[PDB]
């Protein structure tokens, strides 16, 4: 029946990219990601690539296995990878006091 099955979603591809992209760019109808990881020696691993369907309209879940510190995002617009890069998240402190002015 009504099926209007059109992909709509060019987005860059960093580090990882599949053996079928073109000009460093994938195509796909589901939502595009990027994701961030420090491995065992201090180097962060920046990849990002295109997600297919999969049933959610706007939630990225995490597996409740994770054993590691990260940061990953996830965009349904057109290039929100070329230009969003995953960063981790800066430090807080509630104490504080005056060492200087401005």
Known sequence: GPEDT??????YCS???PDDAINNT???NGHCFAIIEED????????SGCMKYEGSDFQCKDSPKAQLRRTIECCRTNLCNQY????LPPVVIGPFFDGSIR
Not at 6 to 11: D, I
Not at 40 to 47: I, K, N, R, S, Y
Not at 84 to 87: A, I, K, N
């Open 84 to 87: 969003l890069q995953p960063t």
């Open 40 to 47: 065992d020696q201090g180097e962060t691993t920046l990849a």
């Open 26 to 28: 994938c195509i796909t």
């Open 6 to 11: 059109l992909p709509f979603l060019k987005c």
């Open 15 to 17: 580090g990882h990219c």
